[PDB]
């Protein structure tokens, strides 16, 4: 009675969306309906392709009259299961209702019941005991062929549920649907453009719609092309009407759609703002103010970022893939960590020392089948989806199992890593930086000779033994971090001294160190083979330790006014504490 | 949260599939944006298109309080949707939307709250605001590609250090009144 809705009547008032294109798909349905056997068609497809619009659009075509004479007289009906089950409290309510509706179909002989999500009725209508499901009830009538119906289901649902019921499948004739071509999509948007133009009181340009389909497929990877494009067109109109001005930008021009796709995809948009331009230009020295030396490494990171934001970048690869190798204590990781801070983007860290076993690597791409925990999905896929624009740090990659390489090989080549669940992660805007200590032993090794020789060349051979040529060939660059020079150490000392002052500022203590004392700390702690970590120990032994005793129990409870200076006679620093 | 709200309102103003889905980790403030929208409305600092709009929060427990008989849950759920469709100036904030996937089902019944809400979401008659964590959205909500397609995901990101202090200052009077205390500026930082 009220469960069924006459789609044709809805078409008269314009509620139904007019179907555009899909001429071939329509033919198959009409042909299936007309044949003697297998009268019921099944529109299999994917979510958003437009399988429902075809059925709803078929009725619209019938009222318009652009269909064969045989189908012109037909009246398509649509069943709402929720209304059918709303009042089926007593015994026999569902059976009498469904059976009553079926009688109407057979007497007419020309109506079609378009039921979407046909898989749902497989187990619906029978709570327990009776087991009188709608699928079983309709089955006999389908055998004769008196009633013809149209179904809709997805591939996964059809195989998992619908295929199980061989009886129903035998009656229905499967139809394979696929997303339309980009050429067909633009025509669909133009046909549907008046509907959205009136609702939003805006005029969409023909150039903008073409950009929407092209830009959406390039960045939006979680939906099919027809619905995906419409989502960018509907939001665009919504954005324009919400402007504070009284619809000044009535027309939807180009470069406005770019904002919507960028916002939906959570990626940087084109026409970079002055703030971003200043941030990228200023990021030539700001990194050099925290990581001294290794200028060639910083340039590689900034160029990849500058290229991608400029618009010149790899079509399917990431912004950049780098392998940071070198001696201990150099800024292989610090330069990466400070990069994320300078850019204001989340830093994704992955200590590869925990992924040294094959079972653990399976957790990155997805979750093991055995686990029944609801927290499925991989650690790397989930993180990337949460922060598409981010820095991915794979520290000590050499420790990880070789299987990890198979994951990165498809990332640097394709840019996407599908998880076990099926979610699609885009690595286009994510920076890829992996550090390693392959050949580090050679760097600290001393030769058997009067002159110590440079074992950097030999260390590279070890890197070529762990990382296959295909892996290195896909890397954008393979940077080698040079050893810290004496001049550089003086800059490193100032960096640690500043950090010390910050810690002291929280306690209201001020520290002033003479240049002579700073130079003395460098000569004691300078070790080319052991990088800059030894310098930290020197700062702890000569500056932190004398003050820790004074801070806890001493004059330096508050105020500070400390003064450190060198004693040339004994080459030892003299500490002066003021109680303030 | 001016940027996040601007997108949520944009989604709600859409002709079709005007159902936002505020996603983010726990504590970011996803429920602060849904409930906050109401507070922002009553204050009067909102676009005229959103004014006079009513936001209703759904309690799934109350919905299934007495749905013992067959079809009772379907009637109650459908009755609520009819009210939203009739007014055309109301929204339904469903928190923990992963729960509505399977709410009322038979021994083998595929029918659930998601199947009933699905047709009206696509039509656009009713607007629905969702809020769920990243873990639940990817392992529960994203499994049903049909229900997710209708919802427009909005990623709520953790705020910066400076943004949070402003939030505490905004909420400082409420907490101060409950404890009859005063918080200094140094404490917040």
């Amino acid at each position: 009675e009220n469960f069924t809705t006459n789609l044709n009547q809805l078409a008269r008032v314009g509620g139904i969306d007019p179907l555009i294109g899909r001429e071939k798909e329509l033919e198959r349905a009409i042909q299936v309906l007309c044949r003697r056997r297998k009268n019921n068609p099944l529109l299999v497809g994917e979510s958003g392709v437009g399988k429902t619009a075809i059925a709803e659009g078929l009725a619209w075509r019938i009222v318009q009259g652009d269909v064969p004479e045989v189908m012109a007289d037909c009246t398509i009906y649509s069943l709402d299961i929720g209304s059918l089950l709303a009042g089926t409290k007593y015994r026999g309510d569902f059976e009498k209702r469904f059976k009553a509706l079926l009688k109407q179909l057979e007497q007419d002989t020309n109506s079609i019941l378009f039921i979407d999500e046909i898989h749902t009725i497989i187990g619906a209508g029978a709570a327990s005991g009776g087991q009188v499901d709608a699928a079983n009830l309709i089955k006999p009538l389908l055998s004769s062929g008196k009633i013809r119906v149209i179904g809709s289901t997805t591939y996964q649902e059809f195989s998992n549920i619908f295929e199980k019921d061989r009886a129903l499948a035998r009656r229905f004739q499967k139809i394979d649907i696929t997303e339309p071509s980009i050429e067909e999509t633009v025509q669909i948007i133009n046909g549907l453009k008046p509907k959205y133009e009136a609702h939003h009181d805006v005029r969409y340009t023909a150039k903008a719609v073409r950009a929407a389909v092209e830009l959406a497929v390039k960045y939006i990877n979680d939906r099919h092309l027809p619905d995906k494009a419409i989502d960018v067109i509907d939001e665009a109109g919504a954005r324009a009407r919400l402007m504070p001005v009284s619809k000044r930008k009535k027309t939807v021009n180009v470069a406005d759609i770019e904002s919507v796709v960028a916002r939906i995809a959570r990626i940087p948009e084109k026409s970079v703002s002055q703030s971003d331009r200043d941030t990228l230009k200023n990021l030539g020295d700001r990194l050099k103010m925290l990581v001294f030396g290794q200028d060639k490494a910083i340039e590689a990171l900034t160029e990849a970022i500058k290229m991608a934001r400029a618009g010149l970048g790899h079509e399917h690869k990431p912004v950049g893939s780098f392998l940071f190798a070198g001696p201990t204590g150099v800024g292989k990781t610090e330069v990466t960590v400070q990069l994320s801070k300078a850019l204001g983007i989340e830093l994704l860290r992955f200590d590869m020392s925990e992924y040294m076993e094959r079972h653990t690597v399976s957790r990155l791409i997805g979750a093991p089948p055995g686990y029944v925990g609801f927290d499925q999905g991989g650690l790397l896929t989930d993180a990337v989806i949460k922060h598409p624009h981010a820095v991915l740090l794979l520290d000590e990659i050499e420790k990880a199992h070789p299987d990890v390489f198979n994951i990165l090989l498809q990332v640097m080549d394709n840019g996407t890593l599908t998880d076990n669940n099926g979610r699609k992660a885009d690595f286009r805007n994510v920076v890829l930086v992996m550090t390693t200590n392959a050949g580090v032993r050679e760097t600290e090794r001393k030769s058997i000779g009067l002159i110590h020789q440079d074992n950097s060349t030999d260390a590279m051979e070890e890197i070529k033994k762990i990382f296959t040529p295909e892996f290195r060939n896909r890397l954008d660059n393979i940077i080698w971090f040079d050893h810290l020079s004496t001049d550089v150490i003086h800059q490193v000392v100032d960096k640690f001294i500043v950090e010390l002052q910050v810690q002291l500022d929280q306690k209201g203590v001020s520290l002033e160190v003479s240049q002579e004392a700073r130079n003395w700390l460098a000569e004691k702690g300078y070790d080319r083979a052991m990088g800059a970590r030894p310098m930290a120990r020197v700062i702890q032994d000569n500056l932190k330790k004398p003050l820790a005793n004074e801070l806890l129990f001493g004059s330096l409870v508050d105020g500070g006014q400390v003064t450190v200076a060198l004693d040339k006679e004994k080459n030892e620093l003299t500490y002066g504490f003021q109680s303030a | 949260r001016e940027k996040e709200l601007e997108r949520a309102i944009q989604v709600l103003c859409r002709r079709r599939k005007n159902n936002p889905l505020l996603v983010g980790e726990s504590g970011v403030g996803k429920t602060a944006i849904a409930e906050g929208l109401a507070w922002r409305i009553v204050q009067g600092d909102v676009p005229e298109v959103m004014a006079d709009c009513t936001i209703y929060s759904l309690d799934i427990g109350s919905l299934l309080a007495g749905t013992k008989y067959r079809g009772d849950f379907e009637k109650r759920f459908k009755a609520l949707l009819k009210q939203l469709e009739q007014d055309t100036n109301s929204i339904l904030f469903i928190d923990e939307i992963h729960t509505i996937i399977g709410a009322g089902a038979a021994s083998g019944g595929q029918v659930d709250a998601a199947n009933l809400i699905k047709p009206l979401l696509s039509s656009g008659k009713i607007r629905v605001i969702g809020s769920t964590t990243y873990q639940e959205f990817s392992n529960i909500f994203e499994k049903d590609r049909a229900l997710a397609r209708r919802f427009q995901k909005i990623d709520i990101t953790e705020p910066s250090i400076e943004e949070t202090v402003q939030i505490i200052n905004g909420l400082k009077p409420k907490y101060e009144a409950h404890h009859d205390v005063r918080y200094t500026a140094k404490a917040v930082r």
């Binding site: - | 008989y69 009772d72 038979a106």
Partner: peptide
């Protein structure tokens, strides 16, 4: 497993 059954009272 743990399945919920909806009863039907007689008319």
């Amino acid at each position: 497993e743990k399945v919920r059954d909806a009863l039907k009272p007689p008319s």
